[PDB]
């Protein structure tokens, strides 16, 4: 029992809202980040993702298409039943900044973790 | 530069992305040539291209849901136009493996790079 | 804040760094509590703290050479001073596995996070 | 036969010079980067690392303590005999930028690849 639908808050402070997961595992939702590496308005954004499909703790993966910037973030993790019986999503992401030349690409990728809980 | 078409990366793996809808969203299929070794196979991958500020070289992020075995991959990158007037997808990914328990999570994620071109 | 002392991270693993020489360099031992599963064990790790601009919270980078099995790890992070006036090592790492051939390289690196404190 | 000593050039354009590797696998050298994510003088710097120790293609790991900035980079990879009989070092690195608060840590880590050859 680890539905992906719902509202979740992360260690960095953000909030993530996911909808009803279908049969092929997909889903959609909004993701208000609580942190920014830019100078723009922290404006909400939609995230698209899929979750494997029969174990209780399935690994998923989604893309959050930010609205206030030319960037994308990709999280990938697994739904765990944190010992007592509370769900906990541990994930990792790659923050893709945008450049102008096919040269300054390396300085474009950032990596970090993120633990989500049911806010 | 658009993620519509048949793409092959540097590992020998192909991938086709059908039409990138109004909003951003897009679908396709992925045929890898490697693995952590069951059988190779296609799987469905869905993504999203970042429109905002109507570029020609935007960042994108798609999730490949490996059917065989409980994996996922996520690719994050930018649609380029390398100086040969051709196209080039420069991206890094994260391969999440399904792990037995919450406390064996530290070892589930793998990081690497891939570069898709056209065929 | 200095990398001198006995440190334990969030995985149950300890680590001790002897004296950080004039230049930067420093040595120590690492005792993990996990693995990709031979036996657990200590191994020697050497690092380097970045002096330039004489800070108190500088970045560092040390390489743990896993003797048992042909691995490596590398940790990159910053010596912090979290608001409890205590210390905190916030770092991410890369675990490289020895692979049979050049063309099976894409799957050798793993990415994750660790946070060492004091004892 | 894959000695680590010597001068190597990387895909990004940089040059790396490594010295004599000892018995415990360690080594030292300079590393002139050919790219910078800052506004400083691209000034040379020393890198410290170790290499496992009996296979022909051993995996290593080193830290490059940059001189023109409060930062550290950590590479980790493996020495491969590129088919014909030329050595080739494939590696990955984590570029650790420095922050001021134990909060803005996530925006601090960058990841990317790097292939070295005997310039």
Q: Is C79 helix (H, G, I), strand (E, B) or coil?
A: strand
Beta B14-17 vs D86-96: how paired, if at all? Answer: unpaired
CATH superfamily of D1-119: Avidin-like (2.40.128.30)
Q: Nearest CA to D115 among C106, C46, B36?
A: C106
Indicate the annotated binding residues of D for biotin.
31
Distance in Å, alpha carbon of A89 to nearest chain D alpha carbon:
18
Q: Is D108 helix (H, G, I), strand (E, B) or coil?
A: helix
Interatomic CA distance for residues A71 and B76, integer angstroms: 10
A34 touches chain B (CB under 8 A): no
D29 touches chain C (CB under 8 A): no
Q: Do A37 and D107 touch (CB under 8 A)?
A: yes
Q: Any idea what DSSP says for residue C16?
A: E
Tokens of B116: 């898709």
Residues of B in contact with C109 (CB under 8 A): 110-112
B109 touches chain D (CB under 8 A): no
Q: Write out the H or E segment, with its range, that includes residue D60.
A: strand D59-65
Ramachandran angles phi, psi of C95, nearest 5°: -105, 110
Q: Write out the H or E segment, with its range, that includes residue B84.
A: helix B82-85
Distance in Å, alpha carbon of A71 to nearest chain C alpha carbon:
22
- In chain C, where the domains are located: 1-119
Residue D84 burial by CB count (10 A; 0-12/13-18/19+): exposed, middle or buried? Answer: exposed
Choose, out of D28, D51, D60, D61, the residue to mutate when testing the contact with C (most C CBs < 10 Å): D61
Q: Nearest CA to A75 among A34, A107, A47, A106?
A: A47
Residue A7 to residues A4, A10, A68, C83, Cα–Cα distance (Å): 9, 10, 21, 29
Ramachandran angles phi, psi of C54, nearest 5°: 30, 75
Interatomic CA distance for residues D110 and C75, integer angstroms: 13
Neighbours of chain B (3+ CB pairs under 8 A): A, C, D
Q: Nearest CA to C15 among C111, C96, C92, C89?
A: C89
Identify whether the C-beta of residue A109 lies closer than 8 Å to the C-beta of residue B92. yes
Nearest CA in chain B to A108: B77
Q: Is D83 helix (H, G, I), strand (E, B) or coil?
A: coil
């Amino acid at each position: 029992k680890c539905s992906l639908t719902g509202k979740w808050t992360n260690d960095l402070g953000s909030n993530m809202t996911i909808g009803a997961v279908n049969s092929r595992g997909e889903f959609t939702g909004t993701y208000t980040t609580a942190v920014t590496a830019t100078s723009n308005e922290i404006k909400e954004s939609p995230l698209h993702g899929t979750e494997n499909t029969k174990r209780t703790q399935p690994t998923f993966g989604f893309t959050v298409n930010w609205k206030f910037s030319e960037s994308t973030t990709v999280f990938t993790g697994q739904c765990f039943i944190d010992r007592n019986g509370k769900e906990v999503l541990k994930t990792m992401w790659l923050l893709r900044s945008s450049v102008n030349d096919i040269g300054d690409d390396w300085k474009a990728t950032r990596v970090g973790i993120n633990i989500f809980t049911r806010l």
